Write a protein that binds this ligand. Sequence first.
Ligand SMILES: COc1ccc(-c2c(-c3cc(Cl)c(O)cc3O)noc2NC(C)=O)cc1
Length: 208
Amino acid sequence: VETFAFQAEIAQLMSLIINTFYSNKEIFLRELISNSSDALDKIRYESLTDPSKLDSGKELHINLIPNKQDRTLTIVDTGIGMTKADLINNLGTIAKSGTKAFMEALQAGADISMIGQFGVGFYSAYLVAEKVTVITKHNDDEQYAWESSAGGSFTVRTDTGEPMGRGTKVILHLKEDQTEYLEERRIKEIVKKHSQFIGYPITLFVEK
Ligand SMILES: COc1ccc(-c2c(-c3cc(Cl)c(O)cc3O)noc2NC(C)=O)cc1
């Protein structure tokens, strides 16, 4: 297990997300679904010139899976997947600029709901999750698990759990007071409100 420090700017963003009073928490789902769609768009585009890129799975879709016993909401997609470099360095390099822009907008009267316009919507997960685990597999790289509970650090390890073929799974370990996001009616409402036109099937699993 390797432990890394967030860039200071990202840590600051995460603290703002965690600490600011902001009731409209539901936006986290739209932002994660949007990231999944972006990743799906990318593998779809690449497959047009190299069909072999789909050998790791033809189906392009998003699943939403609540688990009350584990207190998790999991978002699974079969998009392009992230590489180790993406996880440790490259996405963070991009996020630094977006974060600066977002922070400036907030000071100028924007609200947290606009976070996605700055490319850093993933961090909105911390509105509702105490811990976030991201399991990801890109073609020709290994399966990785990224994890953070904030506090300025994240971990990356090679993942030895169930192989996913290709894509990303975001596991949200929900805060104790945020279990509404495990309810079918609530998730369904949120998807309809904010994600109705996503161009890939979104299946909302129900609980056993
Ligand atoms: C907005 O920034 C990003 C960055 C990475 C990604 C991404 C993802 C990806 C990332 C997150 Cl956080 C997610 O919730 C879902 C995803 O499928 N998988 O591969 C990716 N690679 C690219 C190039 O799309 C999706 C969005």
